[PDB]
């Protein structure tokens, strides 16, 4: 009857079943979720099936300076309004269904390598338009509770960089994935590192550190070598601005230890000026391309030492078998020096 | 736990009105009544006929002013007269409001054989009491 009729809000609230026991603990499949539709969007007050034209409501009150009278559309004319209304509905529905093209990361369904944009602007006139955010890891962590039981939480690792030596990472934890992206992104700009770059394209020297159980052996390379490193390192290096470098990860491939160890070793690298000041000597660069010419890249600001460093017949420096095995043509691997895309 | 006429708490982005923010145990302490007639007084009659008229009026005005009602109706009866008081949004043009006022007043006077008067109070946006 007419007294057993509810409102749209009550009908959709019960039809969607958004708030229910099933939603609470992963008890409902999302393959075919029901979707709310507004059935009043394209409705005009005064338009009915009979095709009546109400002056002042459906149609203009006055025509040619005189008040109109009650009129009713003809069958042919009213049938053309229903079909044109349908086309509007289909057009609206079609546009919503269409999906805008997206840019994938490392994998199609992987969050890693996806950009989150610049961090949110600060209240006190602070902006980070020159920074870029890139996701490294999105984990779904669970915790047993007394009442709810097994509740789902999101842990997100992101890195931010301006491309000119400034970069940082952070962790975001929340129940919604969109809230974890904001926290990590906005908190990474308050924990920024400054990475020194040799000629603005690579590190000053070969780095070989170990964070906990993760081993990272980076190498300095010339221009045009490109980035031949772990995909996560390639994301961070672009953020820092390192064009050319080689890196190998051994041990545990934990993203957080690989991220916390990379920023640690790239911040503790000695430049050529520091080396000169520390030893009061000239740092001379020798290149095969330039032959025997000595290129002075740094000189001490203080008193230049008059005595040379004592030559060492043999140096007691720990070597790496992986590097010695490669130079002597003994490291056979069908996965090294493979043709890949530009990084 | 009790559910009747209660808006459950949310993250904080849900705006509720004064009438919608109070439960039934405040109906005579912090809230009034949306309808005022004599049917329910001691020794009065026709309480079942005034109630059906109220239920129909709220649905008639809700579908006759779609999307324009900010708050619930306040129905008033004084003798023969019936006064409908409503708060409405300013989205709709005045020409359409005057039309619906002259159409609704007249139709409801011939349906309930009584002089019906409708008093609109436009507001820019739905008055917000607090955010639950």
């Amino acid at each position: 009857s007419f007294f057993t009729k509810l409102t749209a809000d009550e009908l959709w609230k019960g039809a969607l079943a958004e708030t229910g026991a099933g939603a609470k603990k992963g008890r409902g499949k999302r393959t075919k979720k029901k979707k709310r539709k507004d059935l009043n969007r394209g409705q005009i007050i005064g338009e009915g099936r009979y095709g009546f034209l109400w002056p002042g409501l459906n149609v203009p009150l006055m025509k040619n300076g005189a008040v109109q009278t009650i009129a009713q559309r003809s069958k042919e004319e009213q049938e053309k309004v229903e079909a044109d209304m349908i086309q509007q509905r289909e057009e609206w529905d079609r546009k919503k269904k269409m999906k805008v093209k997206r840019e994938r990361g490392w994998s199609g369904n992987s969050w890693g390598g996806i950009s989150l944009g610049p961090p949110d602007p600060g209240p006190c006139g602070e902006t980070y338009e020159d920074f870029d955010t890139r996701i490294l890891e999105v984990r779904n962590v669970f915790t047993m509770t007394a009442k709810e039981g097994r509740k789902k939480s999101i842990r997100v690792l992101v890195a931010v960089g301006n491309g000119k030596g400034a970069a940082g990472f952070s962790i975001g934890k929340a129940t919604d994935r969109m809230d974890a992206f904001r926290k990590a992104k906005n908190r990474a700009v308050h924990h920024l590192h400054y990475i020194e770059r040799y000629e603005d394209h690579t590190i000053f020297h070969d780095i070989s550190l170990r964070f906990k159980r993760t081993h990272i052996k980076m190498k300095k390379q010339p221009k045009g070598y490109g980035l031949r490193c772990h995909r996560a390192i390639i994301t961070i290096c672009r953020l820092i601005g390192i064009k050319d470098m080689y890196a190998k990860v051994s041990g545990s491939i934990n993203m957080l230890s690989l991220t916390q160890g990379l920023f640690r070793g790239l911040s503790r690298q000695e430049t050529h000026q520091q080396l000169a000041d520390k030893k009061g000597l000239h740092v001379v660069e020798i290149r095969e391309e330039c032959g025997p010419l000595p290129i002075v890249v740094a000189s001490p600001r203080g008193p230049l030492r008059k005595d040379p460093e004592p030559e060492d017949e043999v140096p007691d420096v720990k070597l790496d078998w992986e590097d010695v095995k490669t130079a002597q043509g003994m490291k056979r691997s069908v996965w090294s020096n493979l043709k890949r895309a530009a990084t | 736990k009790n559910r009747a006429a209660r808006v459950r708490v949310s993250k904080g982005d849900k705006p509720v009105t004064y009438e919608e923010a109070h439960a039934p145990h405040y109906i005579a302490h912090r809230k009034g009544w949306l309808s005022l007639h004599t049917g329910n007084l001691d020794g009065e009659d026709h309480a079942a006929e005034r109630t059906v008229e109220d239920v129909f009026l709220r649905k008639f005005m809700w579908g006759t002013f779609p999307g324009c009602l900010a708050d619930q109706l306040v129905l008033k009866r004084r003798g023969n007269q019936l006064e409908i008081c409503a708060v409405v949004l300013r989205q709709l043009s005045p020409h359409k409001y005057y039309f619906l006022v002259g159409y609704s007043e007249t139709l409801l006077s011939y349906f309930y054989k009584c002089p019906v008067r409708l008093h609109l109070q436009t507001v820019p946006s739905k008055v917000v009491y607090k955010y639950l």
């Binding site: 999906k99 805008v100 997206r102 994938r104 | 904080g12």
Partner: peptide, 17 residues
């Protein structure tokens, strides 16, 4: 098919003291 995820429009705080 991959899961379709796009950045949602940021909300504006509604409740101010």
């Amino acid at each position: 098919r991959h899961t379709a995820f796009v950045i949602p429009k940021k909300n504006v705080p509604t409740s101010k003291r």
